[model samples]
Target: RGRPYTLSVALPGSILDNAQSPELRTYLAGQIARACAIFCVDEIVVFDEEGQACVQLARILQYLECPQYLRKAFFPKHLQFAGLLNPLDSPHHMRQDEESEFREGIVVDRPTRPGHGSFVNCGMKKEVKIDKNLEPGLRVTVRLNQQQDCKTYHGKVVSSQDPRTKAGLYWGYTVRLASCLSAVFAEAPFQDGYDLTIGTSERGSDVASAQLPNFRHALVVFGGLQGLEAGADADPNLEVAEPSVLFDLYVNTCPGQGSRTIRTEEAILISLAALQPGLTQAGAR
Candidate 1:
């Protein structure tokens, strides 16, 4: 659905700097990718604070975001992660079942009988037609039928979720990756937008608001391994593009917390929980 807001997230270059090993790096990357889906993030920007580390982080993020089985087609063979993103925890990974086999699908369109069957989006290029009665936005099992030198291919609905219930908000987020935070704001479409950047700091105000605003486009920035501040001040060495333009407001999401040390992911999940009320509503759509 082409809705209103297109929320973006900016992560520091050293997001994976503290990973103890490659396994930990992979796990953390998976978790970050999962967070993007959970928060309905539309774009990701990794600024160049840690230099070449940002490039590595960007590559890892890009690879992990691709569909599991189709990763090879889009990337080099050496960058494969056959078992990395397939774990039960990351349920939002892209659908990568064999093309000819039956796989689960969601009906993004109302069942239309243009011919003998109904049309469904199923997150595909072509609106697949299913031979069943389906309402708009339904999760159904479907298969793409084909034949030798096939003149045409179509989808057939196998089954759908329970009629009395709906699916949870765990759809995979297809986010675009930006090279740096500045590039996102300087671009044509994103130049004129709100920069709702928040961080953890002793001097910042609390992020306790009653109602969330209906922002069509906003960029949310996250601090890296060393955090976003030094005591009661924003970190001086933090590499951000035009802080005046990109950081409209700075807030401390965990205001009265005792511990000064909080991980990057924890701060993100907490801050989004506190301030991103609109995203929950958007994801529901």
Candidate 2:
């Protein structure tokens, strides 16, 4: 399948610290995950400034991103109070009653002999048979084959990116950890790194004047309580004295804000909303 344009977002995981309780923290992470899904974000980079908050944010984000059926096998019990969070309802989060060309499934043992096809649980009433034998407890994307009998459904294992690349579906985002602010760009998954990087801050230029350029992989960064300057100052890996130098464009996504400070979660929504039009225009060209 052909590669599609990717959009990534980076934020300081320490923002979770602002939450009063564990439930609130999980909800905060869910809000960010919802915004990413709403904007069709491909990847989320959690830069670690505080200790284990980065791990916590990434874990909850991943938990929310995974399909409901496959969550049991992938995430054992790390999620606490995650039930309070809203469902992403992304394209991959399929309902049992709804049928799609592609489904996210987990491989299950069906007492089949060696070299025999494996059974996969695709949230259907009965497990479906896959063309190849895969180990039990493995997660896979299956492309369902046309079969008259619902009891004997068969499918083929397909790439996770296939649904998005082939059918323009908004598959869930992937979460990654970055040790520091600089690593957010350095350890980017794209071969060319983030060709377009935009940083958000009240100190940046107005969002109206900002013009987004064409990009294969674009990244938008959000800061913690103290903002991106504090994040840059705390990271020893970044040689630059100014945080604005790190990004291709640094703009205040929300200008003339009523509040003194915009929380990281709020900033994500505002930034993506402000840039969506320009980004879409650029992508078309």
Candidate 3:
């Protein structure tokens, strides 16, 4: 009954070109992550057509989306400046003391009889026993139930999509890498690919006038400093001369701009805010 549509955003790696130092670059990436979390973005695709920071951006985005408890086990290392970034505080980033029906966990070794399920450290005081004998060091989403003793917990390994689909909770976004602009849509994980594709630019149609169509999966592509035109021109796979033709809807999210240029980080926030109402209405129908 919750949001039925999935929203994915495509971003260019050249957005980091404006940053002078690693700290600023990291902070910029944090802003993007925070923006995505705020708008309940399901996935982020980092398109590296003419930029060098796609790997770095993808790494940090994945790092931030991971739950704090699972971060240590999943991510071996992170940016030293990552500490300065604000926490996403999303539904999945559960605190150690917090209790929930579902929790993200990592497999941990424990002595158990043969045929018994593996132990998972779910950030609780004690580890949980799952229904499956999963290999150690695996990241899993657990459906937990407290035992009659109240001290022990039993769990079942569940798909990452279950939390949001069954419980209507925001499970956080996933990161994907795209070699070029066209690859973003070509490699979509969705069975039908991105059914609704929107490209944001300053020269496109005003966002307010465009009616968002009903879509099972939607993709919004954001351009770098040079804009989507640059990316389209650089991609050898795309024969289209105009970037606007590539998208179902090409929009100027912020029409009247006081500044000569809107930073990609700022553009993302603006674009998502502008589209939320239309997206909600379309999803409801």
Candidate 4:
């Protein structure tokens, strides 16, 4: 989609009615945006409940997690509960009227993109507030790293630090992702990596492989087999293993124990069906 990856700045607390102080709000946003510059982040998921600026842009929250699939005895329903994301595709650029109200940096520079945008130090300060309960990552069954092409990723939140800028202190994370799923939907569900993964030394593509482990992915998309075709690298996750009759007692125990969830035979069947003959040839052409 060639849309620019975003550097989201989640503001803390609600803006009081007339209490809504414009100065306090702008100050925090600037500092957080600065930190995003220094660090690596694509979009900002601000919890400005006070700001309530959800009308900026469409949000897409994709999630990646290794479920703690425990056995029935110990594995409670908590496994599925660990993942959730709010307003996945927030702050949409296409939203003209609403976007006009939200501020885009004029003095400061934009954050990083694969082959575009200049890199800068997100001179993070202590002022902005960061609470997971307030602002958490969206959870869709997609790879975090394999977010669509134009996305940038800052590190995950480690902890809250002292406020530096007049803005004050805020929380920080240590993770990364594409701005949203549809952002790269055309080139997504990669076999093992993001098409934008740069400065790489590896030879293989594992774009969305993280989503499906042990050849368990239902689909694998190849963006560009070798950067030759405009739309060549899209395919299903095609791999499998033989069946085993053993079982484990503990949940989240280890490998084979949880294998029964989605049987290996079923996965293989899905893989075999996903093979497309002309698909690769079209790419080669």
Candidate 5:
């Protein structure tokens, strides 16, 4: 059974409050497509908040998806993602990075060729070849003839060839040189320099970090949680109030101290399972 791919999906200029044009919208999709081609990455979920982060990420997505008439020549064959990342599998700090985290988030990842490339930056997994078949633009969806979990999950095609990706657009010798060099420079040397682009490989394991977004984190948070009403004695306050406690804690500390209303996934998880009398496990973290 083959794996499903994912893209950090985003909607159009409604992102900019309907101010952006149609051309811009199509361009955005196209560029995001190319980003898929370039990185062999399709899961472009934005777990970040709605301020500036979303807007900026939108720009790059547009860049990659824009049509490249040059049909350029590039190297690395094409990047492909064989599997989703599992930070915990390495047995490091599970809480160190967000795995199933939801937020205005950030990450630095690169695509792999259908097969491992010459560069060590071939990325984390054993490269899976890009699927030569499949249409681009709309995220690819296919029914599994025999899915193991009995449940289905949707994913975008990361390494597959599509019109929206660079894998389909070959770059010239110069562009190929630039891309390969970009990979090297991505993991480059810089003791001190604010103006620089870190290669994609280093982006994930190192510098890039995304945010944990605010959402209805309970059973009632999904689409129109209507009809999921509580029984007579259920405290409605607990429904909306859990975050309030954390928010108030942040504000109380926010005054002159410039404190942040920050809590972590692990802390909340432990807090949930905490059986201590004083709520010690998660609460005290």
Candidate 6:
């Protein structure tokens, strides 16, 4: 057991501001998934004064994480969300123990000889061979059985509809709808022996260290379409308030950027990239 970290992105309903079409929404959701996978973000939190937009983003995120083969079985046919998850972009694929959960895989082709085996793409460089009576292009559910082999991952099919049981048919990941930023923090467990807490703001202090040895657990929060920095208006006459001081550190990862403003996903990427050099055997970068 090594160090564990948690990254939370505070997405506002406005994240869907520019995404009017399903295609654009799908694109943005994929980028969020990619950013999370790329940065090893543990949890993503969506909050809004109203519930719809934040909840939708969380749903989209769960849909993206679901394996392609099982996605249809998980979501409705009308909401045919396209796959944004690059096969190589997920962490679930590398699991080696029998304890590993059943992941989605594609039947590349049928075996030359009957009862031999068929080729499948289980998110690896080389196709894994499995003995199953399935046709090519058929989505299948499978898991790694380490006690069986090392080089050749001879996995067994759990069921054609098994992945949905693990990945929700409805919303996925932990999400909350709060009245304000302060309310959102009330529900979250900020640290489980976490040495550091990070908040994102352009005006905040610059990131000084990547090797966060003292920080076994860390939390990174980003503002959504409304932007986190916008919420810092604590004028006595205004209803909006500044970010909570609960955060141990306010970090500005992309210092001196070319753009005037950046999207939440973009911020997530820049912030995590700056912090990536610190993550190692302890965790993913």
Residue-pair clashes per candidate, as listed?
Answer: 0, 0, 0, 66, 39, 0
Write one digit per residue (lDDT tens) for candidate 6, span 150-169.
55567887743344334322
Better of 1 and 5 by TM-score: 1
- Residue by residue across 107-160, what tens digits does model 4's lDDT show? 123333434323211222211111121212221111112222233322222211
Which candidate achieves the best TM-score against the true structure? 3
| Candidate 2 accuracy as TM-score | 0.92
lDDT (0 to 1) per candidate: 0.54, 0.86, 0.86, 0.22, 0.22, 0.59
lDDT for model 3 comes to 0.86
User: What's the lDDT for residue 266 in model 1?
Assistant: 77
Which regions of candidate 1 deviate over 4 angstroms? 82-151, 154-181, 188-191, 194-202, 229-246, 278-285
TM-scores for all predictions: 0.60, 0.92, 0.94, 0.17, 0.19, 0.61
- Judge candidate 1 at residue 93 and give its lDDT: 43
Model 1 lDDT at residue 8: 69
| Model 3 segments more than 4 A misplaced | 78-80, 111-114, 146-151
Write model 3 residue lDDT over 1-285, tens digit each, in one string: 456678999998778767889788889888889999999999999998674599888888888888887877888875535744757889988887888978988988677677888989888887888879878888899988765255557888988888877777888999999999989999999889999999998999999899898888889999888889888998989976889989999999888899999988999999999999998788663
Considering lDDT, which of the candidate structures 5 and 6 is the better prediction for this target? 6
Q: Relative to the unseen true structure, what is the C-alpha lDDT of residue 20 in candidate 1, on a scale of 0 to 100?
A: 90
By the TM-score metric, which is better: model 1 or model 2? Answer: 2
For model 2, the run of ten residues with the poorest summed lDDT: 77-86
Off by over 4 Å in 6: 1-3, 77-79, 84-88, 93-179, 189-195, 209-213, 229-241, 279-285
